[PDB]
Design a binder for this molecule. Sequence first.
Ligand SMILES: O=C1C[C@@H]2OCC=C3CN4CC[C@]56c7ccccc7N1[C@H]5[C@H]2[C@H]3C[C@H]46
Ligand SMILES: O=C1C[C@@H]2OCC=C3CN4CC[C@]56c7ccccc7N1[C@H]5[C@H]2[C@H]3C[C@H]46
Ligand SMILES: O=C1C[C@@H]2OCC=C3CN4CC[C@]56c7ccccc7N1[C@H]5[C@H]2[C@H]3C[C@H]46
Ligand SMILES: O=C1C[C@@H]2OCC=C3CN4CC[C@]56c7ccccc7N1[C@H]5[C@H]2[C@H]3C[C@H]46
Ligand SMILES: O=C1C[C@@H]2OCC=C3CN4CC[C@]56c7ccccc7N1[C@H]5[C@H]2[C@H]3C[C@H]46
Lengths: 206, 207, 207, 206, 204
Amino acid sequence: QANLMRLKSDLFNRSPMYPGPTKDDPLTVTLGFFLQDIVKVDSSTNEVDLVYYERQRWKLNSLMWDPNEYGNITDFRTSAADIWTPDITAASSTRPVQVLSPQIAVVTHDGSVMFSPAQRLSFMCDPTGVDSEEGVTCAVKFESWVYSGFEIDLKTDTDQVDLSSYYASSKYEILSATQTRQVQHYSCCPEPYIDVNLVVKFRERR
Amino acid sequence: QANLMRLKSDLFNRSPMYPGPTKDDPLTVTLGFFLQDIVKVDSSTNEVDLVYYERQRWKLNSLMWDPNEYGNITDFRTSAADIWTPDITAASSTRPVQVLSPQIAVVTHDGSVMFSPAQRLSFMCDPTGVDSEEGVTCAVKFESWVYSGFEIDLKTDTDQVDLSSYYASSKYEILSATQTRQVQHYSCCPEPYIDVNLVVKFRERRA
Amino acid sequence: QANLMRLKSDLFNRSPMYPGPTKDDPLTVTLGFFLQDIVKVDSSTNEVDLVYYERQRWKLNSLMWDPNEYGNITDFRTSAADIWTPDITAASSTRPVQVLSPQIAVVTHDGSVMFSPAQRLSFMCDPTGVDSEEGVTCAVKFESWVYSGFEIDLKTDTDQVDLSSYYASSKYEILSATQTRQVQHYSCCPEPYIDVNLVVKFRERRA
Amino acid sequence: QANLMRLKSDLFNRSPMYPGPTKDDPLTVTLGFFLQDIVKVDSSTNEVDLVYYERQRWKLNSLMWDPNEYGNITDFRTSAADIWTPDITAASSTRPVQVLSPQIAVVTHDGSVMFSPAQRLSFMCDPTGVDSEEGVTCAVKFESWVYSGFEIDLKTDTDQVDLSSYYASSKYEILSATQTRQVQHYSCCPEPYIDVNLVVKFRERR
Amino acid sequence: QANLMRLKSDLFNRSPMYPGPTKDDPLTVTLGFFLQDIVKVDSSTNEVDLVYYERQRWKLNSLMWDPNEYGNITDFRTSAADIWTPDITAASSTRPVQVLSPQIAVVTHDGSVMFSPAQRLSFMCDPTGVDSEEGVTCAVKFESWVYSGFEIDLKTDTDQVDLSSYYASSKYEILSATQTRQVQHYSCCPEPYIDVNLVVKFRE
Ligand SMILES: O=C1C[C@@H]2OCC=C3CN4CC[C@]56c7ccccc7N1[C@H]5[C@H]2[C@H]3C[C@H]46
Ligand SMILES: O=C1C[C@@H]2OCC=C3CN4CC[C@]56c7ccccc7N1[C@H]5[C@H]2[C@H]3C[C@H]46
Ligand SMILES: O=C1C[C@@H]2OCC=C3CN4CC[C@]56c7ccccc7N1[C@H]5[C@H]2[C@H]3C[C@H]46
Ligand SMILES: O=C1C[C@@H]2OCC=C3CN4CC[C@]56c7ccccc7N1[C@H]5[C@H]2[C@H]3C[C@H]46
Ligand SMILES: O=C1C[C@@H]2OCC=C3CN4CC[C@]56c7ccccc7N1[C@H]5[C@H]2[C@H]3C[C@H]46
């Protein structure tokens, strides 16, 4: 109790808040998707609704501490409002993302943070061919909304999207699921933009 | 009035807030479901909507007091924001859980807390066979979202889900309702995770 | 301005907030429903949507003052967040209650408070027979969620639900509307629980 | 910049907030509706959805200033949170009113305020006869929720509801639109209550 | 870290907040739409749902700084609550606009700001003829809600609405997309009101 209370007090009340990465001190942030259900497909609109955990990991020095000065406490939990989180956003969404879990993060003595919100996303997807045997493929970039490759680097830990939480009797069956880092420049803008393309080939169960 | 005001002042204003369990001082939390209606079933999506109370009980020493120093007050009510509550969450939900009751808890002189939110949940469930006589069975884990078996232990008081509040003329009729503790490890993460699996066999009303 | 500003400052800034009733100083709270429309009926789910004002009245000594010390001010208005309100809740709801009015209360020099939120409620109700001439009857308890009969007593002023605000051309026509105090004990719990049962017999409009 | 900053500082930061009208210093508030679309009608429920601007004007002495002491500034804009606004409410609504515009007001040196929120309202209305040529008529009171005639007086500037913003190809066509002050007493309560009845006769487009 | 923290502290904590344009110091604000999907059409109501980024650019002197006094920092990111943003609003919407991106802006040493919210809008539109080959045309003004032409001037950078982000397999296909500045006066009232008319011809 009294240890962790002090630890938190030292980190949050007695700096000003971490104002997010610059070109000078860029930051690396690490995504991992965990598919759960393809809930719905709507062929009137080309909107598909998808449910998943999204594990985000990054590391900050303003969040380091020595376990020894604080009761051999290696890691704690905290409301994600108490800290800076990255602005990772689905570029092709059609409705604001619905949050399905608590907004709580896990900070570790080395300054690393893990934050794994559950979400229901509706995004742009032409689902015709979903009843066919070959299936249909759908994609959605996840990018920082305001930060370039110069300030935030995205990475996957792995190209495989973890289907271990995926619902056995979902109306739809996952053939392929890949999460792939990507760079682009755009004609608008000098800098490189990084994103993680989430790609899912799927079809109706039988 | 002036007694209870002091009691609350001593507990909340004059520590820092209880920052939740660690491996060192783990915490046991106790669930009991109280089914109420299976409101809807949707076979396009395999989404089922379910309504229930969820009684959570835990106990903290930072919440003990002596009735005698505080006007023989054995227990009080408080907004659930004034206190730490556990982060118990349906793992298979498809839409954010809707709260149907006040967010208010009951603290007792011995430091035990009871908090019993009403909720409407939509979760993943293939309902085909719900018109059959044998029915269809559906499940949903309830787990802490950030805390392992090392920090929070879940338990049921009983394997029977209390159907006493269940709606007589619900469109669906409950055949079986079980709430069962469970342990797993997952490949992501070193520690064990506890959960309470809620399992409900049900089917359309008839005679 | 400057009188009422002082009055409010004395009441809210210079006590603690009223920490709600105990067995020792129980509190009586008084409901009156004012039906407005039966908006919708859904026979797939047995959900009925109902719209109404709910007048709550209670009285507190921490809210007394002398009109003479404060500019002959007999009563003021305030956001319902500035004060304790009771946690009166529909026990059989299926979706979170939608608020239709401002959350504002009226406090009076004698310490009595009046608070009359408009609301749209969906609750459990089998509406089959609503097209028949005899109609169909529907009920829903309104209870405090965390407080027993020992801490909060509910009462109606009257068994008649006020239909004066009820919509002339509602899709449904009200045959009976009653608000009836009630006591129960349950096997779960030692104490008595009070509630106000709202009961409404109704059917489709004709010519 | 620097003038208006001072003006605002003097008005908002260095009084207490205006705690709203009493019998002693009542207040007059002035409504004007501007119909825009009758979006939908639902004959299962007798719910109609209507979209409009609602111009509210009132005047306060706590908001007067001399243009000369403040850079000849006659009027400014401000978030409607920075000031008291009246609690004008549709008495027969069936779902909470959806706000379609910014919450911003206009204050003038004489202490008058103008605030014109756009809104989508669902209210109680039997629409049968809406396909007929004669149409169907619908009403909704707009009242202060907690303030009587003794504390707040409502008035229209005009009995005509301004149809100039109304949508040409709305599914429904407006035959009559009137906004009419009204007094009632109600059996619960001693005082008079003022309201502005909005009445709209309308029918399906040819 | 500690540089940018100081920069922000000097700008926001140690002035009053920029209280927005007056006739005296008017402000020019620059819109550019980036269409993305026409998601839905509803011919019962004459409501169409449209998804897009909306790039807003303006410039303030209260936001200038010298890169040299602040660690050669040329530009930073900030929550759009920390700063004044313009109140640009769709005049014909039928439901409150849904926000699809973070509410975050980009401020630059010269005092210019860029803020590019993603949005899903439902607005008034008769879509009959959308299955025809000629298509159907729909429009919606975007205006400041409380500010006249005297206080805020809108401009497009270009009459072409950028369709580069538009979804290949959208249910609807864009024939024309134009963003056009506009003035209107009203007989009641002395001032001009500026708006940017967004106009989109499209079909199945
Ligand atoms: O339309 C664009 C093009 C480009 O798309 C790739 C992703 C990017 C990340 N964010 C999301 C919004 C965006 C932006 C800002 C200002 C105008 C248009 C605009 N976008 C994207 C842009 C980059 C940068 C930025
Ligand atoms: O990969 C998973 C699945 C697994 O689900 C069982 C319960 C758990 C408790 N929380 C919920 C989120 C979760 C987690 C953390 C980081 C990445 C993925 C992820 N999840 C669950 C996981 C455990 C651990 C943790
Ligand atoms: O299952 C019930 C029904 C019973 O209803 C009478 C009123 C009561 C007051 N509160 C509201 C929630 C409730 C409660 C707590 C824990 C498990 C079940 C449960 N409820 C109600 C109950 C009592 C006690 C308590
Ligand atoms: O009894 C009622 C109905 C009536 O509705 C029309 C307008 C009014 C303005 N406010 C809204 C709440 C109300 C009120 C206060 C206390 C008990 C009942 C009650 N209501 C409305 C009433 C008036 C007065 C007051
Ligand atoms: O009815 C109108 C139309 C007119 O539209 C051009 C742009 C304007 C900007 N804002 C948006 C709301 C509006 C307004 C306020 C109060 C009553 C009517 C009204 N509107 C618009 C008006 C102007 C001014 C103002």
